[PDB]
Design a protein around this motif. Structure first.
Motif, PDB file in Angstrom:
ATOM      1  N   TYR C   5       0.826  -1.195   0.000  1.00  0.00           N
ATOM      2  CA  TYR C   5       0.000   0.000   0.000  1.00  0.00           C
ATOM      3  C   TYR C   5       0.865   1.251   0.000  1.00  0.00           C
ATOM      4  O   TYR C   5       2.069   1.211   0.261  1.00  0.00           O
ATOM      5  N   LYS C   6       0.230   2.377  -0.309  1.00  0.00           N
ATOM      6  CA  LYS C   6       0.935   3.643  -0.428  1.00  0.00           C
ATOM      7  C   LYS C   6       1.056   4.309   0.937  1.00  0.00           C
ATOM      8  O   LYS C   6       0.062   4.463   1.655  1.00  0.00           O
TER       9      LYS C   6
ATOM     10  N   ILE E 440      -1.578   6.700   3.412  1.00  0.00           N
ATOM     11  CA  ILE E 440      -2.294   7.478   2.410  1.00  0.00           C
ATOM     12  C   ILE E 440      -3.205   6.546   1.622  1.00  0.00           C
ATOM     13  O   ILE E 440      -3.748   6.923   0.578  1.00  0.00           O
ATOM     14  N   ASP E 441      -3.397   5.334   2.128  1.00  0.00           N
ATOM     15  CA  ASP E 441      -4.233   4.357   1.447  1.00  0.00           C
ATOM     16  C   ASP E 441      -4.784   3.388   2.483  1.00  0.00           C
ATOM     17  O   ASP E 441      -4.017   2.814   3.259  1.00  0.00           O
ATOM     18  N   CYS E 442      -6.102   3.208   2.497  1.00  0.00           N
ATOM     19  CA  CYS E 442      -6.736   2.389   3.520  1.00  0.00           C
ATOM     20  C   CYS E 442      -6.334   0.927   3.349  1.00  0.00           C
ATOM     21  O   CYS E 442      -5.986   0.481   2.252  1.00  0.00           O
TER      22      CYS E 442
END
Ligand SMILES: CCCCCCCCCCCCCCCCCC(=O)OC[C@H](COP(=O)([O-])OCC(O)COP(=O)([O-])OC[C@@H](COC(=O)CCCCCCCCCCCCCCCCC)OC(=O)CCCCCCCCCCCCCCCCC)OC(=O)CCCCCCCCCCCCCCCCC
Ligand SMILES: CCCCCCCCCCCCCCCCCC(=O)OC[C@H](COP(=O)([O-])OCC(O)COP(=O)([O-])OC[C@@H](COC(=O)CCCCCCCCCCCCCCCCC)OC(=O)CCCCCCCCCCCCCCCCC)OC(=O)CCCCCCCCCCCCCCCCC
Ligand SMILES: CCCCCCCCCCC(CCCCCCCCCC)(CO[C@H]1O[C@@H](CO)[C@H](O[C@@H]2O[C@@H](CO)[C@H](O)[C@@H](O)[C@@H]2O)[C@@H](O)[C@@H]1O)CO[C@H]1O[C@@H](CO)[C@H](O[C@@H]2O[C@@H](CO)[C@H](O)[C@@H](O)[C@@H]2O)[C@@H](O)[C@H]1O
Ligand SMILES: CCCCCCCCCCC(CCCCCCCCCC)(CO[C@H]1O[C@@H](CO)[C@H](O[C@@H]2O[C@@H](CO)[C@H](O)[C@@H](O)[C@@H]2O)[C@@H](O)[C@@H]1O)CO[C@H]1O[C@@H](CO)[C@H](O[C@@H]2O[C@@H](CO)[C@H](O)[C@@H](O)[C@@H]2O)[C@@H](O)[C@H]1O
Ligand SMILES: CCCCCCCCCCC(CCCCCCCCCC)(CO[C@H]1O[C@@H](CO)[C@H](O[C@@H]2O[C@@H](CO)[C@H](O)[C@@H](O)[C@@H]2O)[C@@H](O)[C@@H]1O)CO[C@H]1O[C@@H](CO)[C@H](O[C@@H]2O[C@@H](CO)[C@H](O)[C@@H](O)[C@@H]2O)[C@@H](O)[C@H]1O
Ligand SMILES: CCCCCCCCCCCCCCCCCC(=O)OC[C@H](COP(=O)([O-])OCC[N+](C)(C)C)OC(=O)CCCCCCCCCCCCCCCCC
Ligand SMILES: CCCCCCCCCCCCCCCCCC(=O)OC[C@H](COP(=O)([O-])OCC[N+](C)(C)C)OC(=O)CCCCCCCCCCCCCCCCC
Ligand SMILES: CCCCCCCCCCCCCCCCCC(=O)OC[C@H](COP(=O)([O-])OCC[N+](C)(C)C)OC(=O)CCCCCCCCCCCCCCCCC
Ligand SMILES: CCCCCCCCCCCCCCCCCC(=O)OC[C@H](COP(=O)(O)OCCN)OC(=O)CCCCCCCCCCCCCCCCC
Lengths: 81, 558, 73, 61, 494, 99
Positions: C5-6, E440-442
C-alpha cells in the motif's frame, strides 16, 4: 536399511540427474532414457565390487583384532611368571 | 608401465610437429595410466610393512601401492581436460545408442568446440605430466637418500616445465620462473638434509638410519643429534613444496599466474606424493621412550608449520578478490590440518591423515573442474564490466575474479549448487565429507593431548569460513553481470547440422542455435560424481574408512 | 517482491531508522562508555552470581513444620 | 454438538468390557516386548563395536 | 520400514517431485507450492499416527529399526517421551510456514520450497537420531540451507544477517563438537543407550560442560550472544523466521535433555549459579531493550530471547516441574512466536513495506480481525492464563525458584516485564489513536489465509492451555529419568 | 482388595527396584532396574494424591471441627509430603552406598 547394492544403483541414477542439471539438458528426454539403466547399472556393478572388498575387509580386521588380543593375552602371561 | 608409456609416447611425439595430435596424445595417456592401475592392483595381495626392491633402492608397501593407484586415478581425471573438447552440440534427434554408435553428425565445430585452443595444441603436455607422475610415484617408493633426491627433482623439474609450457604467456613464464627459482632453493635444503645424514652416519639407506635411530632410543661420544636436525633441514625443503607456511608465499602467485587447467594438476599431485613420503619418515623416527633426542624432534617444524598454516591460510584469504589466490590460501589452511594429523603420530591420527589427504585431493579437484567449466559456459554469455575487460590472459584463466561469479546461480543453478556443496565441504559443515575429515583429525589431536592446536584449528576455521561464504554470497545473493549473447540467440542465425548413417548417407538435416550448445559430458559427469560423493558420504563410508583402518594397522603392527 | 500500500514515508522517520540500524558502526571506547559496559556486563551479573552461589542449598520449605527451620546450611 | 456425541460412544460402560473400537487401537499399538528386544540387540551390537575400536585404536606401536 | 524414516523421506519426495515436473508438463508456480504444502501435511499425518501409537510409560526408545549393518557413522532413529512433542511441533508448524509465504515469495519459488522441505528433513532428524554425533551432524547441517534462504529471500540487510547466523552457530558448535568428541574417545561410542550409562570424572564433567554450554548459550540465545538472532530473525523471510523461532531455537533446549542432564550430573548441579546468573541477566536485559525496540519484527524476535531464558532456567532446575514446564514453554513459544511474526512480518510488512513502529497507530479501526488475534497473541507472549505459555512459565518458574530462590525471583520479574513490552506494542499498533496518518491508502483486513494460520496458532496455545494434560501426560515417565538425586528414606530400598 | 486389572500386568515391574547385584552390561536388566525404581517413586507420590483427596473430603465435611476429626489423614499426608518425591534413577545408578 542401506543395502550396498540398492544405494549404488540409486547413486548412479543421481549422477545422471546431476549431469543433466549441470549441463542444463531436459531430464527424462525420451530417446535418452537408456542412460538411467546404464548409469544405474554401472552403479550396481560398483556396488557388487564394494560388497566383495567389504567381505575382504571384515576378515582382515577380524584377523587383526584376534591378533591384537593374542599379542596382549600372551604378554600378561609372562608377567605373572 | 609408466616408463614404457613415457618412452613410447615420446617416440611418437618426436616424429610429428602436427598440433592436431595433442588431443589424441592426451587420450592415449589416459589409456596408459589405466594399465598402471591394473598393474598396481595386481600387486596388492601381500601384507607387509615394506619389501625392498631393486637392490634396496626402492620399496613397496600396501600404503605405497594404494597411493600410486590414487595418483593414477587423479591423473586420469585431470588428463580429461586436454582429452575432450570443452563444449558440445546436443539434439534429441541424436541421442539413442544406434545414433551414437552408427550415426554421424556433420557441422562446423571449429569455433563451438575451440578445436584450435591453447590447451588443445601443446603436443608434449601429456608427456611432461607423465614425467611428474613418474617422479611422484618413484618418491613414494624411495628407500635410499640418493633415490629421494633424484625423485623429488624428477617431480619438481616437470612442474617447472608445466608451469612454463604456455610459452607465449608472459604470466606463465613469470609463474614458471618464480617456481623454478624458489624450488631450486627448496632442493638445496633437501640436498643439504640428505648430505648431512650420509656424512654423519656413513649410509644412504633409510632402513639403516631408522636402525641407528631405534638403538639410540635408550630411555657418550657420538650422541645422534644429527638425525633430528638433519631431518629438520630436509623437512623445510618439503614444506616449501607443499606450500605450508611460512614457506607459502610463492603458491598464491604461481597458481594465479599459470593457466587454470595446469594449476589443477600442479596444485594437487605434489601434495599427495610428498605427504605419503613424510608419513613413513615420521613413523620410523618417533622415539617411543621420552629422551634428549625427543626434545629436539624434527617433527616440531611440522607443528610449527601447521600452526602457522592455520593462521596464515584463513586470515590472508579474507581480503583475496582473485579466485585462484583464494583457492591457494584455502589449500594452505588445509595443509595445516594435514600437518597437524601428520605430527601427532598415532593410529587414530594416521587414519585421519590418510582420509583427509584423499578427500581434500578429490574435493580441491572438484573445485578446479567447476571453476574451469564455469568459464567455458560463459561462451554464450556477454558482460559490460570494465574490470572483466581489464583482465590479462583471459584465455588461460577465463575466471580470475570472485565477482565474475556474481549471479552464477541464475545462469546455471546445479553447477552453482555443486560449487556450493564443495565449498561448504571445505568449511567442514556436516553431513558432507569435509566435515568428517576435519572431525577425524580433531578427534585424534584431542585424544593425544594436542588440545591447544585443536582450539587454534576450530577458531581458524570460522575465520576461513568467512571467505568461503563470500564466494557463495557472490553466487547466490546478487544478480548476474553476464547476459545471453544477443546474436547467438537471435532467432535469425542458425548453423546447419546434418545426421548421416553408418555409410555416408544423409538421414536428417537440422538447424541449430546457441541453446543447443552444452558442456561436454566428461566434465559434467566428473563434477556430478564428486559432488554426490561429497554429498552422500554418510551412506557410503564403510569401505573407504576401513581401507585406512587396515593400512594403519599394517604400519603400526608387529 | 510484491507491491504494498501507499505510505507517507517521513524522511525524518526514515532517517531515524537508518541511524538506529547503523549505530553499531560508530561506537567507541570512552571513560564513560567502558564504565557502562563494565557495570552491565561484568559487575551486575557478578553480583547475581555471587548471591546465587552464596545462597545455594541454603533454604528449603518442602514440609518444614512448626518448630523447624527453613534454612538447611 | 459433535463433542457430546463422540464422548458418549467413547465411554466403554459401567462394567462392560472395552468396546470393539477400544480394543482395536490397543491391538495395533501393543509392542509387548518388540522395542525392548530390538533395543537390547542394538546396544549389544554397538557395545561390541565400541570394544573393537578400543582394541584397534589402542594397539601398541 | 520404520515410521520414523517415513518422516525423513516424504520431504525428499517433495523435493524430487518439485524439481522434475518442469520436465513433465512452463509449469505454473502455483503447482509447486501445492506439492510442497501437501508434502508437509503428509508428515503431519504420519507424526499423528506415531503419537496415536506412542506409549507414555516406556523407557525403551520406540519405533526403532534393526540395522545389523554397522558402519562408522550409521543413522539410528528413536522416539521417546521428551523428543516426540518436539517432532510433533515441527510437523505442525511447517505447513503453516509455507502458507505464511504463499504470496510473499515471488522469485525462486522452487528454491524456497526445496530449502524448506530439505530444512524439514534436517530438523526432524535432530529430534530422532539416537546418538550425540548424529545429533551434531543434523544440528549443524541446517546452516547451509539457512544461509542461502536468508540471502536469497531476505530483507535489505540480508547479507549481514546470513553471515551472523552462520558464523555464531559454527563457532558455538565447534566448541560443542570438541566435547562430543571427548565423550566418544572415553566411552568408545555415542549411542544414547551405551553413552548414558557411562559416568565421568568430575573434572571431565566440568570441561565437558563447557563447550556444550558455550554451544547452547549461543543457540539459546542468552543475552550478549544474541546479535545473530536480531539480524537473522528479522531479515529472514517470514517462513524462515517462523522455522528459526519455533523449531531451530528449540534444538538447544532439547540438546540439554540428551547432552547435559543425563551424562553431566555433577557438573550441572555445581554450575547452576553461573547459568542462573546468565539466565536472570538475560531475562532482565532482554526485556528492557525490547521495551525500546522500534522495529516491530525485532521486538517480537528479541522477546524470544526473554522467554528462552525462562525455559533455560527450568531445565537446569533438577525439578520434575521445571523440566516439564520448560518443554511446555518451548512448545507454547513456538505457537505464539510463530503468530507474532505472522502479525508483524507477514501482515504489517506486506501491507506497508516497513517495520518501523513509528508508522503504525490505531489499526483496530480498520482491522478488527487482525486486532483480535494480535491481542490473544500478545496475551500469550505475556504468559496470561488459559494459554499454554502461562503453564510453561509458571511451571518453569516454580522449578527455578525451588532450585535457587534468588534466581527464580529475579526470573519472576518476567511477569511484570513481559506484559510491559507485549501490551506497549499492542496499544501502539492496534490502539493509541484513530489510524496512523502516514497511511495514504486504507488497508484491507486479514485475508482468509491470514485468518486461518493465526486461528490455528492461537487454537493450539489455548486448547493446550485449558488442557495441558495432552502434552504433560506423555512427558512424565521419560522426564523422570533426567532428574539427579535421592531422598534419605526412599533410596536403596531392599 | 481391588484385583489388579489387565493394564496392570505389562507395566508391573518384574524385578525389585535396585541396582544391587546387577550387571550393567546386560541392557535388558539395566533398563528394568531403572524402570522399577521409577515405578516406586511414582506410586509413593500418588499415595500423597489420594490422602489429600481423602483429607479434602473431611475438610469440607467437618469445617469448624476439622482440626480434631480428620487429623489422622493429615499426618499421613505430611509424612508422604516429606518423602514421596520422584528423584529419578541416575543417582542410584551412579553411586552405591552399601549401608
Ligand atoms: C617404424 C620405423 C619408422 O617408422 O621409421 C620412420 C620414421 C618416420 O616415418 P614416417 O613416414 O614419417 O611415419 C609416419 C608418421 O610419422 C607416423 O609414424 P608412427 O608414429 O606411427 O611410427 C613411429 C614409430 C617410432 O618408434 C619406433 O620406430 C620404435 C623403434 O613408432 C611409434 O612411435 C609408435 C610405437 C612406439 C613404440 C615405442 C617402443 C619404445 C620402447 C619403449 C620401452 C620398451 C620396453 O622415422 C623414424 O625414425 C621413427 C623411428 C624412430 C627411430 C629411433 C631409433 C632409435 C631408438 C632409440
Ligand atoms: C565413486 C562412484 C563410482 C561409480 C558409481 C556410479 C556412478 C557413475 C555411473 C556411470 C557414469 C559414466 C558411464 C556412462 C557414460 O559415460 O555415459 C556417457 C554418455 C551419456 O551421456 P550423454 O550426454 O547422453 O552422451 C551423448 C553426448 O553426445 C556425449 O558427447 P561427449 O563428446 O561429451 O561424450 C564424451 C564421452 C566419450 O567417452 C567415451 O567414448 C567413453 C569411453 C569408455 C571406455 C570404456 C573402457 C572400458 C574398460 C576400462 C578398463 C577396465 C575397467 O565421454 C564420456 O561420456 C565419459 C565420461 C566419464 C566421466 C568420468 C567417469 C570416471 C571417473 C569417475 C570419477 C570419480 C571421482 C570420485 C572418486 C575419485 C577417486 C577415488 O553415454 C555414452 O557415451 C554411451 C556409451 C557409454 C559407455 C560405453 C558403453 C558401451 C560399450 C560398448 C558395448
Ligand atoms: C569412492 C569412495 C568409496 C571407495 C571405496 C573403495 C576403497 C577401498 C578399495 C580397496 C582396494 C582398491 C584400492 C583402490 C585405491 C584407490 C585410491 C584410494 C581410495 C579412494 C576412495 C585395495 O585393496 C587393498 O585394501 C587394503 C586395505 O583396505 C589392504 O591392505 C590390501 O591388502 C588390499 O589389496 C580393493 O582392491 C581389491 O581389488 C580386487 C580386484 O579387483 C582384489 O581381488 C583379487 O585381486 C587379485 C588377487 O589379488 C585377483 O586377480 C582378483 O581376481 C581378486 O578378486 C582385492 O584383493 C583388492 O585388492
Ligand atoms: C519483605 C520481607 C519478606 C520476608 C519477610 C520476613 C522473612 C523472614 C524469614 C528469613 C529466613 C527465611 C529464608 C527463606 C527465603 C526463601 C523463601 C522464599 C522463596 C519463595 C532467612 O534465614 C536466614 O537468616 C540468615 C541470617 O540469620 C542466614 O543466611 C545466611 O547467614 C550467613 C551464613 O553464615 C551468611 O553470611 C548470609 O549471607 C546468609 O544469608 C541464615 O541463618 C538463614 O538462612 C529465616 O530467618 C530466621 O533465621 C534464623 C537463623 O538466623 C533466626 O531465627 C532465630 O534463631 C535464634 C537466634 O539464633 C533466635 O533466638 C530465635 O528467636 C529465632 O528463631 C532468624 O534470623 C530468623 O529470621
Ligand atoms: C578459551 C577457553 C580455554 C579453556 C581450555 C580448557 C582446556 C581443558 C582440557 C580439555 C579436557 C576435556 C574438554 C574437551 C571438550 C571441552 C572444550 C574445552 C575448551 C573450553 C571451551 C581434555 O579431555 C581429555 O583429557 C584427558 C586427560 O588429560 C582425559 O582422557 C579426558 O578428560 C579427555 O580425553 C579436560 O581434561 C582434563 O583432564 C584432567 C585430568 O583428569 C587434567 O588435569 C587437571 O588439571 C590439572 C592441572 O593442570 C590438575 O591436576 C587437576 O585440575 C586435573 O588433574 C586437565 O588438564 C584436563 O586435561
Ligand atoms: C576405483 C578403484 C579402481 C577400480 O575400479 O578397480 C577395479 C579394477 C580391477 O580390475 P581387475 O584386476 O579386477 O580385472 C579383472 C580381473 N579378474 C578377471 C581376474 C577379476 O581396477 C582396474 O584395474 C581398472 C583399470 C583402469 C582404471 C581407470 C579408472 C577408471
Ligand atoms: C489440532 C486442533 C484441535 C481440534 C480438535 C480438538 C478440539 C478441542 C475442543 C473439543 C474437544 C473435544 C473434541 C472431540 C473429542 C471427543 C472426546 O470424547 O474425546 C475425549 C478426549 C479425552 O478423553 P479422556 O481424557 O476422558 O480419556 C481418554 C483419553 N486418554 C485416555 C487417551 C487420555 O478429549 C479429546 O480427545 C479432545 C481432542 C484432543 C486431541 C487433539 C488435541 C489437539 C492437538 C494436540 C496435539 C498434541 C499437542 C501438540 C504439540 C505440538
Ligand atoms: C471468549 C471471550 C468472550 C469474548 C471476549 C471479547 C471478544 C469480542 C470480540 C470483539 O469485540 O471483536 C473485536 C473488536 C471489534 O470491535 P467493534 O465491535 O467495536 O467493531 C467496530 C469498531 N471497529 C471496526 C473500529 C473495530 O475489535 C476491537 O475493537 C479490539 C480488538 C481487540 C479486542 C480483543 C477482545 C479480547 C479477546 C480475549 C478476551 C479474553 C481474555 C482472557 C482473560 C485472561 C484469562 C485469565
Ligand atoms: C465446564 C463445562 C462442563 C461440561 C461438562 C459436560 O458437558 O459433560 C457432559 C458430557 C457427557 O456427560 P459426562 O461427561 O459423561 O458426565 C459424567 C462424567 N463422569 O460430557 C462431554 O464430554 C460433553 C462436552 C461437550 C462440550 C460442552 C461445552 C460446554 C460449554 C463450553 C463451551 C462454552 C463456549 C460455547 C460458545 C458457543 C458459541 C456458539
Amino acid at each position: 536399511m542401506v543395502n550396498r547394492i540398492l544405494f549404488w544403483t540409486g547413486f548412479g541414477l543421481a549422477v545422471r540427474f546431476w549431469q543433466l542439471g549441470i549441463e542444463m539438458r531436459p531430464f527424462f528426454n525420451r530417446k535418452s532414457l537408456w542412460a538411467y539403466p546404464l548409469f544405474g547399472g554401472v552403479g550396481a556393478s560398483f556396488g557388487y565390487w564394494l560388497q566383495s572388498i567389504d567381505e575382504k575387509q571384515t576378515k582382515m580386521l577380524e584377523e587383526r583384532k584376534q591378533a591384537i588380543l593374542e599379542k596382549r593375552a600372551r604378554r600378561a602371561q609372562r608377567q605373572a611368571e | 608401465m609408466i616408463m614404457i608409456s613415457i618412452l613410447s609416447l615420446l617416440l611418437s611425439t618426436s616424429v610429428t610437429l602436427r598440433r592436431d595430435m595433442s588431443i589424441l596424445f592426451n587420450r592415449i595417456s589416459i589409456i596408459a595410466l589405466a594399465y598402471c592401475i591394473l598393474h598396481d592392483t595386481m600387486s596388492l595381495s601381500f601384507i607387509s610393512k615394506g619389501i625392498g626392491l631393486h637392490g634396496g633402492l626402492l620399496h613397496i608397501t600396501n600404503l605405497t601401492q594404494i597411493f600410486h593407484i590414487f595418483i593414477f586415478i587423479i591423473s586420469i581425471l585431470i588428463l580429461q581436460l586436454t582429452s575432450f573438447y570443452p563444449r558440445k552440440v546436443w539434439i534429441p534427434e541424436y541421442s539413442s545408442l544406434k545414433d551414437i554408435f552408427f550415426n554421424k553428425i556433420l557441422y562446423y565445430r571449429t569455433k563451438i568446440i575451440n578445436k584450435m585452443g591453447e590447451h588443445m595444441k601443446i603436443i608434449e603436455y601429456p608427456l611432461i605430466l607423465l614425467f611428474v607422475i613418474s617422479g611422484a610415484v618413484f618418491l613414494i617408493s624411495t628407500n635410499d637418500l640418493v633415490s629421494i633426491f633424484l625423485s623429488i627433482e624428477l617431480q619438481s623439474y616437470g612442474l617447472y616445465l608445466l608451469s612454463t609450457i604456455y610459452r607465449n604467456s608472459e604470466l606463465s613464464t613469470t609463474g614458471g620462473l618464480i617456481y623454478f627459482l624458489l624450488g631450486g632453493l627448496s632442493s638445496c635444503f633437501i640436498l643439504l638434509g640428505t648430505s648431512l645424514l650420509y656424512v654423519n652416519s656413513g649410509t644412504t639407506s633409510l632402513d639403516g638410519l631408522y636402525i641407528l635411530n631405534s638403538i639410540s632410543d635408550v630411555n657418550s661420544w657420538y650422541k645422534p643429534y644429527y638425525l633430528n636436525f638433519s631431518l629438520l633441514i630436509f623437512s623445510i625443503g618439503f614444506l616449501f613444496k607443499v606450500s605450508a607456511a611460512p614457506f607459502h608465499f610463492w603458491s598464491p602467485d604461481v597458481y594465479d599466474a599459470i593457466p587454470t587447467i595446469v594449476t589443477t594438476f600442479v596444485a594437487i599431485i605434489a601434495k599427495i606424493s610428498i605427504f605419503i613420503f613424510l608419513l613413513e619418515l615420521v613413523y620410523y623416527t618417533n622415539s617411543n621412550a621420552n629422551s634428549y633426542l625427543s626434545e629436539f624432534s624434527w617433527t616440531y617444524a611440522l607443528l610449527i608449520s601447521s600452526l602457522l598454516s592455520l593462521i596464515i591460510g584463513t586470515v590472508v584469504g579474507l581480503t583475496q578478490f582473485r579466485i585462484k589466490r583464494l583457492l591457494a590460501y584455502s589449500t594452505i589452511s588445509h595443509v595445516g590440518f594435514i600437518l597437524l594429523a601428520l605430527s601427532v603420530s598415532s593410529i587414530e591420527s594416521t587414519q585421519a591423515f590418510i582420509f583427509y589427504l584423499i578427500q581434500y585431493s578429490i574435493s580441491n579437484l572438484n573445485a578446479f573442474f567447476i571453476l574451469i567449466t564455469i568459464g567455458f559456459s560463459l561462451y554464450g554469455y556477454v558482460t559490460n564490466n570494465k574490470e572483466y575487460k581489464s583482465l590479462l590472459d583471459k584465455n588461460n584463466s577465463p575466471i580470475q575474479l570472485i565477482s565474475q561469479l556474481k549471479g552464477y546461480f541464475y545462469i546455471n543453478p546445479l553447477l552453482s549448487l555443486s560449487l556450493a556443496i564443495t565449498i561448504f565441504s571445505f568449511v567442514g559443515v556436516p553431513p558432507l565429507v569435509g566435515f568428517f575429515a576435519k572431525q577425524m583429525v580433531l578427534s585424534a589431536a584431542l585424544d593425544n593431548g594436542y588440545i591447544f592446536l585443536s582450539l587454534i584449528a576450530i577458531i581458524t576455521s570460522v575465520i576461513g569460513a568467512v571467505y568461503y561464504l563470500n564466494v557463495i554470497k557472490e553466487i547466490f545473493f546478487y544478480s548476474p553481470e553476464h547476459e545471453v549473447n544477443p546474436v547467438l540467440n537471435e532467432s535469425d542465425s542458425n548453423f546447419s547440422l546434418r545426421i548421416l548413417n553408418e555409410k555416408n548417407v544423409l538421414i536428417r538435416s537440422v538447424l541449430l542455435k546457441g541453446r543447443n550448445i552444452f558442456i561436454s559430458s566428461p566434465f559434467s559427469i566428473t563434477i556430478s560424481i564428486i559432488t554426490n560423493v561429497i554429498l552422500l558420504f554418510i551412506f557410503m563410508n564403510k569401505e573407504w574408512l576401513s581401507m585406512g583402518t587396515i593400512l594403519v594397522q599394517i604400519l603400526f603392527s608387529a | 517482491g510484491l507491491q504494498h500500500y501507499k505510505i507517507a514515508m517521513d524522511p525524518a522517520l526514515v532517517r531515524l531508522g537508518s541511524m538506529i540500524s547503523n549505530r553499531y558502526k560508530y561506537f567507541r571506547w570512552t571513560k564513560r562508555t567502558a564504565l557502562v559496559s563494565f557495570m552491565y556486563v561484568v559487575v551486575v551479573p557478578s553480583t547475581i552470581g555471587y548471591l546465587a552461589y552464596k545462597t545455594d542449598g541454603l533454604w528449603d520449605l518442602r514440609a518444614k513444620r512448626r518448630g523447624d527451620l527453613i534454612s538447611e546450611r | 454438538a459433535s463433542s457430546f456425541v463422540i464422548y458418549n460412544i467413547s465411554r466403554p460402560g459401567p462394567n462392560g468390557e472395552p468396546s470393539s473400537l477400544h480394543k482395536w487401537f490397543s491391538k495395533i499399538s501393543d509392542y509387548k516386548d518388540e522395542w525392548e528386544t530390538r533395543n537390547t540387540l542394538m546396544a549389544a551390537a554397538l557395545e561390541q563395536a565400541a570394544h573393537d575400536k578400543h582394541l584397534l585404536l589402542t594397539a601398541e606401536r | 520400514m520404520s515410521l520414523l524414516y517415513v518422516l525423513l523421506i516424504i520431504p525428499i519426495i517433495g523435493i524430487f517431485l518439485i524439481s522434475t515436473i518442469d520436465s513433465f508438463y512452463f509449469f505454473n508456480v502455483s503447482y509447486y507450492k501445492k506439492i510442497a504444502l501437501i508434502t508437509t501435511i503428509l508428515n503431519l499425518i504420519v507424526s499423528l499416527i506415531i503419537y496415536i501409537l506412542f506409549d507414555f510409560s516406556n523407557n525403551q526408545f520406540q519405533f526403532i529399526q534393526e540395522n545389523l549393518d554397522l558402519s562408522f557413522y550409521d543413522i539410528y532413529l528413536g522416539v521417546d517421551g521428551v523428543s516426540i512433542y518436539f517432532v510433533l511441533l515441527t510437523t505442525i508448524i511447517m505447513p503453516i510456514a509455507l502458507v505464511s509465504n504463499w504470496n510473499s515469495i515471488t522469485n525462486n519459488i522452487k528454491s524456497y520450497l526445496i530449502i524448506m522441505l530439505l530444512l524439514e528433513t534436517l530438523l526432524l532428524a535432530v529430534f530422532l537420531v539416537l546418538d550425540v554425533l548424529l545429533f551434531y551432524i543434523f544440528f549443524e547441517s541446517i546452516l547451509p540451507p539457512l544461509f542461502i534462504l536468508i540471502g536469497l529471500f531476505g530483507s535489505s540487510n540480508k547479507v549481514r544477517a546470513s553471515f551472523y547466523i552462520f558464523l555464531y552457530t559454527l563457532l558455538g558448535s565447534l566448541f560443542l563438537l570438541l566435547s562430543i568428541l571427548t565423550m566418544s574417545s572415553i566411552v568408545g561410542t555415542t549411542y544414547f543407550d551405551v553413552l548414558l550409562k557411562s559416568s565421568f570424572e568430575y573434572t571431565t564433567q566440568l570441561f565437558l560442560f563447557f563447550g556444550i554450554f558455550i554451544a547452547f548459550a549461543v543457540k539459546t540465545p542468552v543475552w550478549g550472544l544474541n546479535s545473530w538472532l536480531l539480524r537473522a530473525h528479522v531479515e529472514s523471510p517470514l517462513g524462515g523466521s517462523i522455522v528459526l523461532a519455533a523449531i531451530v531455537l528449540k534444538l538447544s533446549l532439547y540438546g540439554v535433555f540428551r547432552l547435559i542432564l543425563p551424562i553431566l550430573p555433577q557438573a550441572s548441579l555445581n554450575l547452576t549459579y553461573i547459568v542462573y546468573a546468565i539466565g536472570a541477566i538475560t531475562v532482565l536485559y532482554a526485556s528492557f531493550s525490547t521495551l525500546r525496540t522500534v522495529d516491530v519484527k525485532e521486538l517480537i524476535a528479541y522477546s524470544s530471547v526473554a522467554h528462552a531464558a525462562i525455559y533455560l532456567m527450568g531445565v537446569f532446575s533438577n525439578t520434575i516441574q521445571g523440566l516439564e514446564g520448560a518443554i511446555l514453554l518451548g512448545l507454547a513459544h513456538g505457537f505464539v512466536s510463530s503468530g507474532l511474526f505472522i502479525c508483524a512480518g507477514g501482515i504489517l510488512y506486506d501491507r506497508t513495506g516497513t517495520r518501523l513502529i513509528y508508522f503504525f497507530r490505531g489499526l483496530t479501526q480498520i482491522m478488527p480481525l487482525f486486532s483480535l488475534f494480535f491481542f490473544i497473541l500478545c496475551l500469550g507472549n505475556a504468559g496470561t492464563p488459559l494459554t499454554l505459555n502461562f503453564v510453561g512459565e509458571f511451571m518453569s518458574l516454580y522449578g527455578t525458584l525451588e532450585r535457587l530462590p534468588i534466581a527464580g525471583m529475579l526470573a519472576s520479574t518476567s511477569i511484570i516485564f513481559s506484559a510491559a513490552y507485549s501490551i506497549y506494542m499492542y496499544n501502539r499498533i492496534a490502539f493509541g489513536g484513530s489510524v496512523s496518518l502516514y497511511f495514504i491508502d486504507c488497508f484491507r483486513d486479514l485475508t482468509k489465509r491470514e485468518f486461518f494460520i493465526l486461528f490455528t496458532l492461537v487454537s493450539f496455545t489455548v486448547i493446550l492451555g485449558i488442557y495441558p494434560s495432552f502434552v504433560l501426560d506423555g512427558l512424565h515417565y521419560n522426564i523422570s529419568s533426567v532428574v539427579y538425586g535421592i531422598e534419605p528414606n526412599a533410596s536403596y530400598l531392599t | 482388595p481391588t484385583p489388579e486389572s489387565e493394564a496392570f500386568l505389562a507395566k508391573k515391574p518384574q524385578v525389585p527396584p535396585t541396582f544391587d547385584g546387577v550387571d550393567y552390561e546386560d541392557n535388558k536388566r539395566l533398563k528394568q532396574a531403572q524402570d522399577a525404581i521409577i515405578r516406586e517413586q511414582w506410586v509413593q507420590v500418588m499415595m500423597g494424591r489420594l490422602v489429600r483427596e481423602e483429607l479434602s473430603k473431611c475438610y469440607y465435611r467437618e469445617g469448624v471441627n476439622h482440626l480434631e476429626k480428620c487429623g489422622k489423614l493429615r499426618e499421613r499426608y505430611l509424612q508422604l509430603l516429606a518423602n514421596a518425591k520422584v528423584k529419578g534413577y541416575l543417582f542410584e545408578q551412579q553411586n552405591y552406598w552399601s549401608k
